[model samples]
Target: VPHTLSTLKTADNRPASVYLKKDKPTLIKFWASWCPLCLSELGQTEKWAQDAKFSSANLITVASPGFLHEKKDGDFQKWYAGLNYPKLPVVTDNGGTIAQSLNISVYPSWALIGKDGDVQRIVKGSINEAQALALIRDPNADL
Candidate 1:
């Protein structure tokens, strides 16, 4: 797998990319703006990511506005700006490119990238706090 993956746009609509490092795991969250369940879990997910215990992992959120909705450029960014999630850096997956690479066809998914910059596991649903912590701590261990 490539360490330097897709070049996506950040919540601020700026060019950005996630350079995977061999030191810590990277947790990539795949969500869509049209999903109500996804919006509901934002607070809890942010809280979980902000926990210092999970500092060993890099937490990033990917918003796919083109997944199941029609949102123009900067639309998602504007929506994200209104939220108060300083810890979690959210990127815009405008065309589901990253989602396609990870085989994530649904909303509210998560991809755990191991230390080797390889995808450890892909969870296609919402995860609890314990599961989130365990995933980052030991990506190879079964949840």
Candidate 2:
């Protein structure tokens, strides 16, 4: 069942809301800097974001609580710079507002949203680049 992510504030204090809208398929990666699994998975996700196919898909990474935090923008920026992550828009969920709204309880979780603003799947834990590609290609794919 697809659900709407709560309208929350971004790291820059911008009003942001993640929804299932009919345009491009969206991939949402929920991760935290403190989680080894999430850190590992982020590398793969970063690579996946560079793919041409994924270019059309909205690939977004959300840094929830336990990652950096509201006041640790520099730390998060440094971490991102060190990782050399592609310039995909990364959002921060300080106070776990977005995570709580999404019911995310684990790091390295992924959600695929279809064009109709419906969540296609919710995958948890570490996943390889190939598996992630496969999931993005097939909306009905099961994790």
Candidate 3:
């Protein structure tokens, strides 16, 4: 969807935003640091992000409020430091504002946003690389 908001931050402490319109598909995954399935799914997502075919699509992983605790950011950084996932951009939504706006109802929900800024599909479960890639490759493809 075309987010009215402007910028957000990445898990690695980088600034980001959702400016892509309806013509471009954006894939957003809502996850928590404590979710075991999210961790496994993220591995596949990271691999998908590195693939050349998905370069045109904007792929982002948002760490919502459910996992935010005191010193959580530092804990997240330490956990991510050991991984080699440069392709995936992880962001924090400590206040749950983004998740609320997006109407996310689950820990591992994947939103496929169409070019028109509308949600094309919302898959609330463990995500695989093929499923994510299929959505990015063809937004019209049913999930």
Candidate 4:
């Protein structure tokens, strides 16, 4: 998606970043600070982000403040820092503009963008590793 959709930030107030290469698929996980389910499955999310099998793909986790309910940058930063994950490039969608652009209504959801920058799939709930891989490798494949 176009970066112009919203303003994103990092934990320390830097510009948010992601690695959406032209020849690689990008898997985006949308999460919120207020969702316990999102927190509960964070370990799995981090694991997926670091998996060698997924090295060729672009994996990212987005924290949506609109879904966070608190809607404060400070609150989002504090919550982001509290996360134990060590992955880089985690971004905060301050106004949930990206989420809204993608039509994501669930607290924890997934979006797969193909190498060509087309939105391939959108999973409204939790997705397993195998499912994620399948979608990443073949976006048209039913899961």
lDDT of 2 at 98: 55
TM-score of each: 0.83, 0.68, 0.74, 0.86
Candidate 3 vs candidate 4: the TM-score winner is 4
Candidate 2, superposed: residue stretches over 4 Å from native: 1-22, 66-86
Q: Candidate 1, which ten residues in sequence have the lowest lDDT sum?
A: 13-22
Model 3 weakest 10-residue run by lDDT:
65-74
> Can you rank all candidates by lDDT, best first?
4, 1, 3, 2
What local distance difference test score does each model get?
Answer: 0.72, 0.63, 0.67, 0.74
State the TM-score for model 1: 0.83
lDDT computed for candidate 2: 0.63
lDDT of 2 by residue, 1-143 (tens): 22324354334444344423447778888877777776666656766766685665777777754433323655654565556454444676555555665677776777777867767777876667666777788966653
Give the C-alpha lDDT of model 1: 0.72
Report the error of model 4 at residue 68, Å: 5.5
Per-residue lDDT tens digits for candidate 3, residues 32-119, read 7677777777777777656777767777777764343312655666676677677777776666676777777777888877756677
Per-residue alpha-carbon lDDT of model 4 for 65-84, expressed as tens digits?
Answer: 64647357667777678767
As a whole number from 0 to 100, the lDDT of residue 38 in candidate 3 is: 76
Q: Residue 85 of candidate 2: its Cα lDDT? A: 56
Q: For model 1, how does the per-residue alpha-carbon lDDT over 16-68 read when each residue is reduced to its tens digit?
A: 44423447778887787678888898887787667887778877788766555
